[PDB]
Design a protein around this ligand. Structure first.
Ligand SMILES: O=C(NCc1c(F)cc(F)cc1F)c1cn2c(c(O)c1=O)C(=O)N1[C@H]3CC[C@H](C3)O[C@@H]1C2
Ligand SMILES: O=C(NCc1c(F)cc(F)cc1F)c1cn2c(c(O)c1=O)C(=O)N1[C@H]3CC[C@H](C3)O[C@@H]1C2
Ligand SMILES: [Cl-]
Ligand SMILES: [Cl-]
Ligand SMILES: [Mg+2]
Ligand SMILES: [Mg+2]
Ligand SMILES: [Mg+2]
Ligand SMILES: [Mg+2]
Ligand SMILES: [Zn+2]
Ligand SMILES: [Zn+2]
Ligand SMILES: [Zn+2]
Ligand SMILES: [Zn+2]
Lengths: 32, 270, 270, 69, 31, 252, 47
DNA sequence: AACTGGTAGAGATTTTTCTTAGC
DNA sequence: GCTAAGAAAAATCTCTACCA
DNA sequence: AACTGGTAGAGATTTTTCTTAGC
DNA sequence: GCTAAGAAAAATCTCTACCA
């Protein structure tokens, strides 16, 4: 949802939560 | 996805002729695809590539042009490497008078290359006969491109400003033209060496002759053949003449071509 | 010495009009004296100072001009801060049609300042009456200087290239002019914000109104008068309104003038 | 038989992608933009183009050269 | 360093380079 | 350095060499060598032209010759009045540096128009090579006569053959190479003289070895990065920069 | 131009289900459009 | 004493993003 | 599992013609 | 397949030169 | 006696109009 300098907001399981960048891996998604 | 966006962008450009930023933002396609949609259109493509070239400035090249002043015809020739000017007033703009002007110029100075535009007096059989007899190579510019002859049009501007400066000291226009040629050639300084145009043409032609005679005497007593290794494949090329050896690289001549090869890739043989 | 050289240089310039480098090298006088000898001559001094100015780009300024295409008269107005274009075809180049065009423009958009050249239709009593009724300040450019109105002549060029792009989709010239106005205003992007011209005029006018209302609400509840010390003499000036206090300097308003004063030279009083 | 066909298609692919350019140029007394042409030689400052079996020299300030991706 | 028929070898700031003949002006420069 | 200056002074004392040869041989700068020549009591034209008129086939040919090289400029005049002679002189003075003109006592050479052109262009005119050059030019004109139709074309073709095709003399040069060499040598001498006067407007106070008193005012000749050549007591000597003080001199 | 190559690559993937580097090398289209042609197919997956 | 050049596209150079080989 | 080389793709910079 | 913008002056900014006050 | 501040004078850099 949002990618910050040190924080990342993700949607999972109909829930929004904030994970820091040191525990995240962002990959491209091809799900058209 | 954006494949239907690509089809919509092609229809939209066919109607409105959008640029690539408008299509890449409205239809959300990448910028390479939008650049291709604009680049495959013939109604667009009306713009050049925004650069300038550089003219030939060899020590025996002259440029020539004709200009008009008070209902007269002036013809101007300029030596390109120094800025040295000859100019005269013609009774008409025919090819006979242009051929006589070029023959007097070749009788006074060494002329080997002449550059002109495509005027009717320069593309003439009389001018062609004079260039054949005096051994001059004549080149013409691209038609309707006055930037090919940039030096002689700049000198048209300078000659007209000097003529308006000293106009009230002469009666006729021909006297004023010769007075302006004298003022340009000997009374104005500044440029490459702080010279005038007359001092610069003397320096350029004298240095040309002296440097040819010096390296004739140098090359007639040489030795030290050089075998060198260059190319995309590490091959060996033939007999090369060593010209100068410097701290870091050497200068060789191979097939009348000058090359600068580093010292690791060559060996000198007495 | 060089005092007789100064007299000889004055006689020589009176005859030949040397430049300062020629006289300073031939007569061995210093360069300040040779520069003065050239600067006291009226036959010289034919050259400008080689700079460009910048035009007024306030958020309610419009520029206007007339151009010709296929024997018709087009009239173009441009909003300067955004690049937004209105254009029409006139039956004649009189002052009545120019006054009607300006009245329709003022009925559509907020116009407070109009800049034109000195054409006969713009210096007219009908245009003066419309500007009086609609409260517009009309300014004219320096005569025979098209660089004063640079934006509307640039837009003359852009409008003519779009009209040659979409010419074979219309029958008359007036339809083609309105299609080119639509293509410029809404189908071309790139510039300050990556906008088109329509998005940029909406953003500029809306941000103008919003920022005035915000600082009205901010300034109506202020406090903290400021006494500050500035000037060539260390004096004390009167009551100033504190606007913003930053780490290093403060912003004060004195006599409807905004000033940035460092923190050492001011004291805040509640 | 098949291997020589593969090598020939590879070399023809490289030769077809070396110099297939289009040129839109601007020439004449009234300098209008004219249609596509084939690039023959490109020096610094000017190009030689072939248009309708006519050879022309155009400066690079009055031409646009379109490549292939 | 050397003046050829279509190329000139110059030394500029301890860098040797080869320039075409039509892009050079060779002076002795008294001054 | 000082060894080279003493060797150059001894060699000039024997053989009286010139300054270009001494500067090339003994490896000293050119202003020092020019000073060595200038201090000798036993050691103390590129811009003179001659004009004449001649006749050929009922036409008037006017010939100007550069004397130090044998260089020729010629023309065909419509008449032999003073206005056409003044126009030919103005064109010659516009293309070459002309300072001294030598003519005979003809009518058209003694005229108000020629006098006004010589006043405006600052030429010294004297009334009294050209005849030998006229004979040589007319042999060439009768040699290449059948390659041209008119007489003006044959005159200019003979001027080209004389200037750039006939070689002789000491080194085997044509006339155009000799005139360019002569004028270039004169240009080198005037530029060096300008530098000499600009340097010699200074003055030097120097402190000799094992003395704490400054010596007399010696005139500056050459100023280097670490050395200074001064003239004092009709003697040239080299003092380093750490024992020198250079001040402006106003001694006009 | 490669837009006709885009249309031909869509037909070719509807038949044979090529990978994206194969379509990019054979039809001379960029890699983003080739990955998009793979991505819009429900049976395939770009890897 | 109170006025004024600008716009948009073509290449060239530099920076950011994306996939895959290797330890 | 993590890094980094290498290439693709996007962003920034310099320079040109035309507007009576 | 083998062609091409340039010149000179007006200010602005930076560097070199010259005189004199001070320790 | 030596240094350095300060100003004068010279040198270098950027940018403009005009040449059919
Ligand atoms: O536009 C001219 N100059 C101005 C200018 C410039 F000098 C340099 C620039 F970079 C830009 C410029 F705008 C110009 C035009 N022509 C001729 C010129 O000599 C000439 O200088 C010329 O002789 N011809 C003949 C050959 C065929 C016919 C007769 O048309 C052409 C037209
Ligand atoms: O030379 C013009 N443009 C070209 C150009 C440019 F746009 C911008 C530039 F930086 C340089 C340019 F060379 C041009 C000339 N004139 C008028 C124009 O509008 C106009 O655009 C105009 O209206 N008048 C009226 C007012 C008095 C009479 C009628 O003469 C003037 C002439
Ligand atoms: Cl032409
Ligand atoms: Cl006007
Ligand atoms: Mg011409
Ligand atoms: Mg011309
Ligand atoms: Mg107008
Ligand atoms: Mg206008
Ligand atoms: Zn299009
Ligand atoms: Zn003057
Ligand atoms: Zn002697
Ligand atoms: Zn599939």
């Amino acid at each position: 949802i949002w990618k910050g300098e040190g924080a990342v907001v993700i949607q999972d399981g109909q829930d929004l939560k904030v994970v820091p960048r040191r525990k995240c891996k962002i990959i491209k998604d091809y799900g058209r | 996805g954006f494949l239907d966006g690509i089809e919509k962008a092609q229809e939209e450009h066919e109607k409105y002729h959008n640029n690539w930023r408008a299509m890449a933002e409205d239809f959300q396609i990448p910028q390479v695809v939008a650049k291709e949609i604009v680049a495959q259109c013939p109604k667009c493509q009306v713009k050049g590539e925004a650069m300038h070239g550089q003219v030939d400035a060899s020590p025996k090249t002259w440029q020539m042009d004709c200009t008009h002043l008070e209902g007269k015809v002036i013809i101007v020739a300029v030596h390109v490497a120094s800025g040295y000017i000859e100019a005269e007033v013609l009774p008409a703009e025919t090819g006979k008078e242009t051929a006589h002007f070029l023959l007097k110029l070749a009788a006074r100075w060494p002329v080997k290359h002449l550059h002109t535009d495509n005027g009717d007096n320069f593309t003439s059989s009389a001018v062609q006969a004079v260039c054949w007899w005096a051994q001059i190579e004549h080149t013409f510019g691209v038609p309707y491109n006055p930037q090919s002859q940039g030096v002689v049009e700049s000198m048209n501007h300078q000659l007209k400003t000097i003529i308006t400066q000293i106009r009230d000291q002469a009666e006729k226009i021909e006297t004023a033209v010769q007075m302006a040629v004298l003022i340009h050639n000997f009374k104005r300084k500044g440029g490459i060496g702080g010279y005038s145009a007359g001092e610069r043409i003397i320096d350029i032609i004298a240095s040309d002759l002296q440097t040819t005679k010096l390296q004739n005497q140098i090359s007639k007593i040489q030795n030290f053949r050089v075998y060198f290794r260059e190319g995309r494949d590490q091959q060996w090329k033939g007999p090369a003449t060593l010209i100068w050896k410097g701290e870091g690289a050497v200068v060789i001549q191979d097939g009348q071509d000058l090359k600068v090869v580093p010292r690791r890739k060559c060996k000198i043989i007495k």
